[PDB]
Amino acid sequence: ASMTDQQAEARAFLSEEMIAEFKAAFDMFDADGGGDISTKELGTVMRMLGQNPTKEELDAIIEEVDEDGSGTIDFEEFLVMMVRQMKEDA
Numbered sequence: 001a002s003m004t005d006q007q008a009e010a011r012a013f014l015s016e017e018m019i020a021e022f023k024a025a026f027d028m029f030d031a032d033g034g035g036d037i038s039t040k041e042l043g044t045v046m047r048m049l050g051q052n053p054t055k056e057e058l059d060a061i062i063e064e065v066d067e068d069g070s071g072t073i074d075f076e077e078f079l080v081m082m083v084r085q086m087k088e089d090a
């Protein structure tokens with residue numbers, strides 16, 4: 001019954017103690033209660049760096065990490081992102 005191997009793999013790698021470390025910084029990113037992020041809400045935290053983004057450019061940014069269809073970035077997708085680099089060296 002292995003169809004969603006994508007995120008299923010990141011869940012087994014990251015325990016409850018490690019998942020908690022991201023729990024705090026997860027709601028920070030969203031800022032809409034803490035359930036699922038978006039392309040607009042995300043653009044805000046990204047700006048903190050020191051640049052000037054746009055609505056059109058943000059939709060391409062997520063287009064990278066959004067190979068599902070939903071369009072949002074729920075807790076059951078953010079963990080798959082960070083996990084990708086964790087693998088070996090990346």
Ligand SMILES: [Ca+2]
Nearest residue numbers: 030032036037
């Ligand atoms: Ca939201």
Ligand SMILES: [Ca+2]
Nearest residue numbers: 066070071072
């Ligand atoms: Ca998604």
